[model samples]
Target: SYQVICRDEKTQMIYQQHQSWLRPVLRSNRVEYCWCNSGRAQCHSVPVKS
Candidate 1:
């Protein structure tokens, strides 16, 4: 698999976005979160479970 680039853990403040516009977009686009199956009203990933 290809590596997915991301920000450093200590500099992850950008992930603190609270606008919530893309949350629904992810569901509409059928994107599967880590802890989600699909077709549900709510989906969230397991935090730091790796």
Candidate 2:
């Protein structure tokens, strides 16, 4: 089990979730961001550690 964090490049919105409940964000002109889990590959982004 793990936690995942995602950030929107354009909006700068931050999303936090558990590994099991995590999903990818789809958008045009995308940016990469993820942290703390296997979802990083799919998320394609930088990690935000807190």
Candidate 3:
């Protein structure tokens, strides 16, 4: 499992999403893709500090 930090372009709000290993890997060229309700969103991997 991994934590995905997504930022909404329209609302400028942050969203968190849990991604599994089975899911498709997010490409660096396509950072503007997210599973959020917003049409324009950008997502990136966040490191767990715990």
Candidate 4:
């Protein structure tokens, strides 16, 4: 449940892991919502019962 920003000042090429559940968002490289601290209140990834 975390996103890590690895630092290596030596490299110029950037690498990243992008995650999303929606097909369109994944295709467009976008996430509909961020659940960083909104789990109990609500989440875009899961249902309320989950």
Report how far residue 18 has shifted in candidate 1, in Å: 28
Residue 18, model 2: Cα distance from true site in angstroms: 6.7
Q: Which candidate, 2 or 3, has the higher TM-score?
A: 3
lDDT of 2 by residue, 12-47 (tens): 555565332233445543434444354342345433
Q: What TM-score against the true fold does each predicted structure earn?
A: 0.16, 0.27, 0.30, 0.17
- lDDT order, best first, reads 2, 3, 4, 1
lDDT of 4 at 40: 24
Q: Which of 1 and 4 is the better model by lDDT?
A: 4
Where does model 3 exceed 4 Å of error? 1-3, 18-50
lDDT of 1 by residue, 1-50 (tens): 32322222322322222211122223334433321122122335333322
Top candidate when judged by lDDT against the true structure: 2
What are the lDDT figures for the candidates, one per model? Answer: 0.27, 0.44, 0.41, 0.30
lDDT of 2 at 50: 24
lDDT of each residue in 1-50, candidate 4, tens digit only:
45533222323322234321221243444543322232221125322331
Give model 1's TM-score versus the native structure.
0.16
- Which window of 10 residues has the lowest lDDT sum in candidate 1? 13-22
Instruction: Give residue 15's error in model 4 in angstroms.
Output: 4.7
Candidate 2 residues lying further than 4 Å off, grouped into runs, are: 1-3, 18-50
